[PDB]
């Protein structure tokens, strides 16, 4: 049975399952809960036209371009989350400052697009914390911009989601994705990669105890990290044409330092 | 079980190696240490080299050097492709499978296998050319004019950081058939029996890993990550392909291509 050794593992797994739960307020579970009307409760108000977009906040707390700066400060919220997460991964603040920020500017988006896949099913995506739920086809029309830039993201959380994660194999996934070491420009690659190198392992355990039955879905989640790295640069490109369409639009200055260069 | 796997594992191998010519094990040799392959790092190494070795198979089709490099990489990536499919014909599984599947599998798949053993012909100084009867050196190939210069340098780059891993050709032979049976790619027709084959064969590549490299910490981990480097080295290329339609300004040629 279980040793000295995968007794670690099973410590460190528990350990980055609680630091997420404390960084996450809506994890997969909840967003599920509500999603599958697990309640009466929970039931989110749905907004697939103008027409419910207008209650919309008259029943939740350009229109095209409203919708992508919420969208877009609500990025800059889970940024801030993440980042709150990844100070909690054993080592990470160990390492050099310069370091800590280029793994941070490089995993973010992988990690939001991750955790997004949670609040998507085919039809649509949670909103401001559950409480509404924009359908993808009223995303779709939004308009010659902005209507495309969701749809790569239900492509992939729909993929994705077909692999059945839960919370607590995606809190060791999410760590595995910050310490890379593969990013460009890191001062110090070994110590990252050493701290990978326990995670992944970490990880590989809980896929194995998580899903018996599972063949494989350790390579198959590792795989998914291609899928995250197209997604993100559509969307940095998508941006660059928003840049030059909307002049009068502005970005937040911390998405503005992440997409610097990437 | 873990027998069914290791019977696997050795038939890649086998068959990897009657696929392939120029292996890694032979390659390594090559590179480090009795004949040295003749070195092109100019112009006039260049010009010599034509004559030499005479991987004349490419040039003699009837001027700018920067121009016959390119090209002559394509002769050698057509003639990789039938390498790649005919090692592909022996994955247990693969012709059993819908055949417009086994096109889409191999259109998709030669380009990633194909940077994947160059790495096994480079180092971070140069890549072994026409059969490892050549060394281009890494800086003549920078040297080169217009996006010329730029098409080879992302593959070093990827090279240098896949071949710390150090794998050799038993471990190559299962990691290639894995890129083949990939079914994510657009257009399949039925994506299950095509999953099921990779199941087996990633299987078969962590026990491999596993055995032959106990020393290597999560090596199966790292290696399938590197799949991503692939994928961008890949759509990367095609990107200096399309600019490369700038250069221009045989139709038979052309259409071999
Ligand atoms: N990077 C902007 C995409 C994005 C991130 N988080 C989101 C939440 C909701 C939404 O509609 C869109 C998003
Ligand atoms: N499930 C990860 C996304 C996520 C975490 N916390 C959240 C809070 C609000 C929200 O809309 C989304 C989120
Ligand atoms: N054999 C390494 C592939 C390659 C790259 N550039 C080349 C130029 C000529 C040639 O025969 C081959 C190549």
Do not use: W
């Not at 409203?66 to 609500?74: E, L």
């Not at 989601?161 to 690659?189: K, Q, T, Y």
């Amino acid at each position: 049975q279980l040793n000295p050794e995968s007794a670690d593992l099973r410590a460190l797994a528990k350990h980055l399952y609680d630091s997420y739960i404390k960084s996450f307020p809506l994890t997969k579970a909840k967003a599920r809960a509500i999603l599958t009307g697990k309640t009466t409760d929970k039931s989110p108000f749905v907004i697939y036209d103008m027409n419910s977009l207008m209650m919309g906040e008259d029943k939740i707390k350009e229109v095209a371009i409203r919708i992508f700066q919420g969208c877009q400060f609500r990025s800059v919220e889970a940024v801030q989350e993440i980042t709150e997460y990844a100070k909690s991964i054993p080592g990470f603040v160990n390492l050099d400052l310069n370091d800590q920020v280029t793994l941070l500017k490089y995993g973010v988006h992988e990690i939001i697009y991750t955790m997004l896949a949670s609040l998507m099913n085919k039809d649509g995506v949670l909103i401001s914390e559950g409480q509404g739920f924009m359908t993808r086809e009223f995303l779709k029309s939004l308009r010659k911009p902005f209507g495309d830039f969701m749809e790569p993201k239900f492509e992939f959380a729909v993929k994705f989601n077909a692999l059945e994660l839960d919370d607590s194999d995606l809190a060791i996934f999410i760590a595995v994705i910050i310490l890379s070491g593969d990013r460009p420009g890191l001062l110090n690659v070994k110590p990252i990669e050493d701290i990978q190198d326990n995670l992944l392992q970490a990880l590989e355990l809980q896929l194995k105890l998580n899903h018996p039955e599972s063949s494989q879905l350790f390579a198959k989640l590792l795989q998914k990290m291609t899928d995250l790295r197209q997604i993100v640069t559509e969307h940095v490109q998508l941006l660059q044409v928003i840049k030059k369409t909307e002049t009068d639009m502005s970005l937040h200055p911390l998405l503005q330092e992440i997409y610097k260069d990437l």
